[model samples]
Target: IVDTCSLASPASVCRTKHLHLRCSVDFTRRTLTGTAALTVQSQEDNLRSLVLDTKDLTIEKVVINGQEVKYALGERQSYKGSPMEISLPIALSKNQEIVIEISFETSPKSSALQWLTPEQTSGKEHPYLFSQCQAIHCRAILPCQDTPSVKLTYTAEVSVPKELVALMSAIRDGETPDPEDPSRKIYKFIQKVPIPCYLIALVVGALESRQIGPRTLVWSEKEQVEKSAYEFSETESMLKIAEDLGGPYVWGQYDLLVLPPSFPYGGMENPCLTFVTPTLLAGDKSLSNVIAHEISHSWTGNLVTNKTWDHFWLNEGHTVYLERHICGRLFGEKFRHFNALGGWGELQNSVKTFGETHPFTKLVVDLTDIDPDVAYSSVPYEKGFALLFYLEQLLGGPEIFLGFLKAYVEKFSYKSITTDDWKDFLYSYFKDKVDVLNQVDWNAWLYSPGLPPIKPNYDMTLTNACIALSQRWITAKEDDLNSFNATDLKDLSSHQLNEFLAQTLQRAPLPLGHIKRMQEVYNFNAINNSEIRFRWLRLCIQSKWEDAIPLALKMATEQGRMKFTRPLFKDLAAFDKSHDQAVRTYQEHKASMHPVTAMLVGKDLKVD
Candidate 1:
């Protein structure tokens, strides 16, 4: 129902030759005026019509090849509504161009179409500027074929206050400051590559940048700009690793622009300049995982795009795999473990909520039908990542999978591919070696609500570790503790330690002697690695070892910024009835926590 190419019907296909667009913005009056030219291939019908998509915008005029034409404003339906139909009294031959001009006003605050404010006005409270043109909103700003498949080159010229900087996907052609009045500037940009209408973007505001590597860049608002820009220095290194592992960075001049808190998604992977949420500007630069995910899109979503929103998993799944891979390579293997745990948690929650009756094909078939608010849940991102993980496990390692990905990217560099194309690529790549690709029913994972049962090896490892740690705690003598190094205690696996802690807490009241011993153990354990120390503190609180609360507070103060440990500390503090101070401290500093941790704590503690 969404006519991206200005075609009258969804069944009809048309190729555009060229598109010309010109727009002027009056910031003071909050108005937009624009004209567009659509040059199309020859059609047999002389009375051909075009469908232009728009919503709640006034159209002043319509002309086809200099002749005024009658147009009808179609009924506003659901998101799947029909496009606006403009019928010409006479159809034009192939290679003919049609020009139309329209004018409209936008309320700055009420309209979704609004300009980005300069950093000086918003102070450090805001970070970047972004534009959201999905659905039919692009028509509210500019005249165009507002669909994903109709690719076109664009030239945008805007008049804005001289003090503000305006940016777009492509490099700027030129800028002219008003000679008579120094308060205005005319910015122009030309994009030579043919891009879908939905990908068109414009961000205007005050900004600054720091170069990290060749063509690798980061940007932030002017206030506290250097610290914010420098935080993403690892981007270049990550790009280098991605190139070494797969294909070259296809997108030129990679840049990240931090946007305001009101930005909808965590980040929008706009071609050259990525728009990120200001909330992600962790002062300590501890959480750049989202950066990794967006950058990976250069190869995944940007290079090999999805044919339809129905095939969204093709974009998000591959990006999730690359995100975790880059994070593990750059940070550590434990970082990957943390990411996997989060994915598992998400899958479990999805299964509990949605149940197993939901079909897997729904991802491809019922995509546009789903609500937008729950659109970013585990089904597309997390569940898709799990599919990649299973594929890697099925194939042996990541190297072959990387080869498959590189091959796919190279095969479909600038073209959009469908889900069938993906399956064909997989089967073709692994035709002779193994049937692993064919063995599993991929559709079940994609559409179905439940995930495959946890692997047996994982359960065994966790159980053994938990039992061993508990046994160590039970048999420890005073003399034996003299030589017990923190590393020895800390090295126990999480499963073993959790099992021990659970068993020890079942007994009603711990003897005073046992409480003192637990406090001593926790004091030494707190100095160990964050994961181990957090486990110890959790156990201490659960067992009512009140003296160990200070150790828990100290650990949270020093390293609670860690993605996994932050939530664990928050949960322990919430459960500790004796120490309200610890609970309050965790709450106060909770904003410093990573998004994944915040999501977990938000669910477990019922905190806003």
Candidate 2:
């Protein structure tokens, strides 16, 4: 019953059933003063103590049944945090439940949270704070059984300045003026559905909300409220598509929160309110597919969870597959193929970046004594999708496999499960197709490092133009560069252009003069689409163009989305002139970046 990725013991021994939190957001101290009342139960007979996970927390008191109790915080590990061992006053019978309340305070250096000063926001008036607690960072936010193996319902009453607003992953109950402190107000939230602690998110700032659909609201600062509403206007359509594919959307309100520029990921699928990065605000809604991706997570990641970090593919891979289906319903089958093909390219890049034999490139990894953050990449998402996509074709088609998916979700909703459990269910569902399934190379797919054993035949009808255009430029001579013109890109869609740039990046660096001429012909530097601009800037850096240094640095620093920032910084470090500059820029701007982003970029730069 040991989970290599988590320090918590098996839930079969003891588990948390519910968590009630009363906390105050202190902007001046940049900390959280709180009490977490945990409803715990013993799964085994004669259990005497309960163990919980925590990091950078100062515990002041512990209580149980109206009496003080003894608690000890174990020694801290680098990323695993410390384990809090609580000695119960008496032994508990099997299935016996009890409430253990503890008073504590979160440190300012908590890895799960980021505090932004007013100068870091769009409107420089109020400070902002947010949380990103996926993988294992939840331990830093609260003391709990912090593994995904344990799921619990929760309620929160948060106090903050009356001028600011507070949000959480749960449904908003209401708010009222604070009777104890006239300058503070209390906000209430309730999460009826059981979820892993990692999904317990919080954000506080000067905010506003606008209803974008029947059951959806887009929340952001006043400066970005209207633009966010317009950017994610099609959220209802995506939700409808996701609901048609997966079963009912159990999470009642599918809201959106457009975070500041420093958000690390494209989106965090935090149950009721999905946190999104402002980089997606392309104005044309071309980037709204990210919203669809996060919406798909409502069923895939949030409802049906991964039991541990090792089986992370269960959350990400399934979500990517569902996201593509939603896009297919809106656009066309070919567009889905186009997006999947792009994912394959990303998978190749990740494999190369980690080296072909690295353990992190495997679909299922071993995380004992390893930080889950170091193991993160596109392998789980894309490689896992490839296996499923291959199986879809081998056993009938998408329609038949989609039947299996719906059944899978129905069976595993609200439970955290392992890859073995998933495979067993798959086999059970497709009992008649066992003969074909037996032919699969499960070892190479799930255990062995490097690329998959077989690459599925992806439909490339939409990417043919992208490939042809990229190849013409790659193989073009300086004298024949005149053949390129603005009309060359006139017929391509923005996504097609994105793929065109990705294909160019996949090949060896192009001749510097050719890139210069192509830039002059296409004027790619002027494109507002972040995806297009990101790839174009990387191409410039790869070719060692001195003129593009400032442009690449600007793009990397202006917004802190790691997808664009990390690679750009790594590429700049590889260039001779910008090596020191890469380290210097990160040193200067790391304060404005998310904690996770700053740490990872520091690793990429090989600096403290």
TM-score of each prediction: 0.70, 0.99
After superposition, which runs of candidate 1 have C-alpha atoms over 4 Å from their true positions? 1-12, 16-19, 29-31, 38-47, 79-82, 88-121, 124-129, 134-136, 178-182, 332-334, 355-362, 368-374, 452-608
**What TM-score does candidate 1 get on C-alpha atoms?**
0.70
Candidate 1 lDDT, 493-593, residue by residue in tens: 44334344544533323444554665555553533433345555666665666666677666554442333344445545655464466556657755544
Q: Write the per-residue lDDT of candidate 2 for residues 586-606, one digit (tens) a residue.
A: 999887678888899999999
Q: Candidate 1: lDDT over CA atoms?
A: 0.59
Error of 2 at 3 (Å): 2.1
User: Scored by CA lDDT, what does every candidate get?
Assistant: 0.59, 0.91
